[PDB]
Amino acid sequence: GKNIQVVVRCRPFNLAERKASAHSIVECDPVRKEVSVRTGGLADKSSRKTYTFDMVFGASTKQIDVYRSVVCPILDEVIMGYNCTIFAYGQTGTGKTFTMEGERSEEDPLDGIIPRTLHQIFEKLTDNGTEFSVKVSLLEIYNEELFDLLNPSSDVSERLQMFDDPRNKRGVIIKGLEEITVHNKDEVYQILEKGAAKRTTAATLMNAYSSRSHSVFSVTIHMKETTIDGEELVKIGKLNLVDLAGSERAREAGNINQSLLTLGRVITALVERTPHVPYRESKLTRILQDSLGGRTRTSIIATISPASLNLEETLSTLEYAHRAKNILNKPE
Amino acid sequence: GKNIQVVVRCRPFNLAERKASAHSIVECDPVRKEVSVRTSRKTYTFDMVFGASTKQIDVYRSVVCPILDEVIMGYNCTIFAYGQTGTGKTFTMEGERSPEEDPLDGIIPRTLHQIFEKLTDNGTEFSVKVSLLEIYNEELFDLLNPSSDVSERLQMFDDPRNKRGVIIKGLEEITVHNKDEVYQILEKGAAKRTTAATLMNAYSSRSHSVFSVTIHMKETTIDGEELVKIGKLNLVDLAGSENIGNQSLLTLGRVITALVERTPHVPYRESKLTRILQDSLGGRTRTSIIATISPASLNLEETLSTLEYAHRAKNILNKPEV
Ligand SMILES: Nc1ncnc2c1ncn2[C@@H]1O[C@H](COP(=O)(O)OP(=O)(O)O)[C@@H](O)[C@H]1O
Ligand SMILES: Nc1ncnc2c1ncn2[C@@H]1O[C@H](COP(=O)(O)OP(=O)(O)O)[C@@H](O)[C@H]1O
Ligand SMILES: [Mg+2]
Ligand SMILES: [Mg+2]
């Protein structure tokens, strides 16, 4: 019960889990906001471990219903001119990218957050008369090094440098980052497309895999609203959509442990109001600082597998989400 | 190495791999017997290397035939499939039935078809028995016993005729009276494996699966010799290599290195698996490990780990380049 929402989304079985003879160990109960996992080793059908969250989504949960519960309330905040962040956390293949982006293959029912938010920003702002402009940026953090995914020319190993700008505190300046003007609703798709192809090339040429790196898609809205006898009103607002690296050579994995672990140290600090927030201690936390501790709405989506095969990773991601906002199991 | 062969079989991409837009990170060179992984590039060399287009029949022709010729002479032999869950261990050991021999038949059914075809064709007098057990959490479960219940596990004892040998009390052995009986036999085991996973949580991906075929032979030739023999083939489908980090996989590996390098101690007694199998690993015998891997970037960490395992078990120096 705070500005920090921690929720869990369990995916359906994949084909590999079915080929492996995996069994369902995850039980999701949306009404009690609980998730339990049968933890039993040999001959133990007794032990189950429960966790309670702000929200629990089962495997049959639709995209649009994750959007309506988690994203709408954050968008309103943004439209009022605030900075907010939504994180997808979890094991590779549990649906981080699916939640954040989705796919096409009205509103395409497989759409994730990113295309859906754009469509609403446009629908809402154009309905209520607001004067506005929409900018998006997409970068990637691999090995504590930033890479612009949207820069049309300059396709290379080219890193971006980050400076702590004297101008504003809490903030940071990334020199050279492409910010693209979004001219209309459906334009997200080709922008996601361009970022994709580039992402692919950085996978093959630098072996930087999207499963090993943080993906930050930023949208900024400039709004001007006026009403007769209504006070002309000027607002900027910012929405950060972060698709994290997998939570599951030796050097760079040590690094991804450090960031997620720091991001978590940060979220725990925000929840507790316990001062001294260690934004400093990783690039990711640094890039996002202005949208985090400065009071705001913040959300974490934790993804999980239903299968016995994934039990260790599933428990870790729930141990993690739970260390982030500790909320107690309730009786009965 | 000699009678210890270590080969790799890489499987084709699967769908999750295509849809993730996974990059193929291994090159398998059959001719140079090499597997390379882009990581720069790490290259390993084996006794043989099977690309993703390798058919079951070719694996068998190449790996099994010589091992089986050896079993038919009256010797005990072992073949292991090692690798990550999903890479093809069961596809290699068993195969799949499709909806002349099913081109999708793995080692177990081809071995049984060959034993029958070969031994009746030379007019040898012979009897085939098979047994199937499962190792989970250092405990033995018979998959062929029609009776009892999920929770019953087998006890082994030292064997007074054989110091390298072991007796598993109550292990069910099934006579095979013809070629195809092996299909229904494999089906009984699967049904019981399902039960044990449901009731005991012994999950198949977490379990060593040991399929042993025993052959009794009397071969007679007028003007030649009267030959009495017992052959044994153990076909072992290991637990998923991602569980490494259990010790039984690590012990198996330490035991194979000792055999290849010949160090004074070979630690068979340090796992049920090596214990069970010590009699066919007793050296001067055919032993073969098939290491299975995926080609995709998704699976890299585990593919590297499998290759390291394979390389540590038998360490072959790389030849020179182009
Ligand atoms: N809730 C869900 N419903 C349907 N499909 C899903 C769900 N979550 C994940 N998937 C599917 O699982 C696969 C892997 O998901 P992906 O988002 O690529 O995972 P990650 O970002 O965690 O690596 C994709 O094929 C995606 O369609
Ligand atoms: N070499 C191969 N050629 C064709 N299909 C394969 C191969 N290896 C595995 N497969 C397929 O991949 C899937 C998983 O195989 P499986 O044998 O269950 O792996 P494992 O038992 O090691 O977990 C199955 O659909 C199987 O048919
Ligand atoms: Mg992803
Ligand atoms: Mg298997």
From Swiss-Prot, chain B:
Gene Ontology CC: ciliary basal body; cytosol; intracellular membrane-bounded organelle; kinesin complex; membrane; microtubule; mitotic spindle; nucleus
Keyword set includes NADP: no
One of the record's GO molecular function terms: plus-end-directed microtubule motor activity
Location(s) in or outside the cell: Cytoplasm; Cytoplasm, Cytoskeleton, Spindle pole
The keyword Nucleotide-binding is assigned to this record: yes
Post-translational modification: A subset of this protein primarily localized at the spindle pole is phosphorylated by NEK6 during mitosis; phosphorylation is required for mitotic function.
Residues annotated for ATP binding in this entry: 83-90
Superkingdom of the source species: Eukaryota
Gene Ontology BP annotations: cell division; microtubule-based movement; mitotic cell cycle; mitotic centrosome separation; mitotic spindle assembly; mitotic spindle organization; regulation of mitotic centrosome separation; spindle elongation
Disease as annotated in the protein's UniProt record: Microcephaly with or without chorioretinopathy, lymphedema, or impaired intellectual development: An autosomal dominant disorder that involves an overlapping but variable spectrum of central nervous system and ocular developmental anomalies. Microcephaly ranges from mild to severe and is often associated with mild to moderate developmental delay and a characteristic facial phenotype with upslanting palpebral fissures, broad nose with rounded tip, long philtrum with thin upper lip, prominent chin, and prominent ears.
Protein family (similarity comment): Belongs to the TRAFAC class myosin-kinesin ATPase superfamily. Kinesin family. BimC subfamily.
Subunit structure, interactors included: Interacts with the thyroid hormone receptor in the presence of thyroid hormone. Component of a large chromatin remodeling complex, at least composed of MYSM1, PCAF, RBM10 and KIF11/TRIP5. Interacts (via C-terminus) with the kinase NEK6 in both interphase and mitosis. Interacts with RARRES1 and AGBL2. Interacts with TPX2.
Protein name, entry field: Kinesin-like protein KIF11
Coverage span on the entire protein: 16 to 365 of 1056
